[PDB]
Amino acid sequence: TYPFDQNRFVQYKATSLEKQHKHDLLTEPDLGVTIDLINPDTYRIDPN
Amino acid sequence: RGSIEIPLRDTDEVIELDFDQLPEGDEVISILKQEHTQLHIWIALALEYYKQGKTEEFVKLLEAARIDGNLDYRDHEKDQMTCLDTLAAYYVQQARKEKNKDNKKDLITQATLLYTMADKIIMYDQNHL
To answer: Which family is this sequence assigned to (chain A)?
Structure first.
């Protein structure tokens, strides 16, 4: 048999498999907005 | 705005609280309630505190406005349900900006209990649901 190195370590690296991943944005589960009908004290629907 | 009006019992529409300074909200409860002032002003200065950049004294001074639903108001219980739906929404909102020390339930309990009294008078508000 061949005396293979135990490849317990990454030096290639997997960075081709890594930066291909586009990373989710899940900071706030309702998508980063406070959902409120009271804090719209203002409205652009008025003129103009 | 930066100073709206707080009506008196006798010779009303005379006194003002300028909101550029920050008074403590508990003495505001006093100076409102020795004057038997209408519940609408409690919402108005709550909005003043919120536009002053406050989310916590804003939401706790209104807890003192939960006592005076119809105190001398001649059926401003519509005004009390408007008061209480603000706490029923902003307790659960301030629970989402929770800190390292309290629990989410440390505000969700107060949100859920006060919502029960919010549904005692009025059902299926645009904010109840």
So the answer is: Belongs to the PAF1 family.
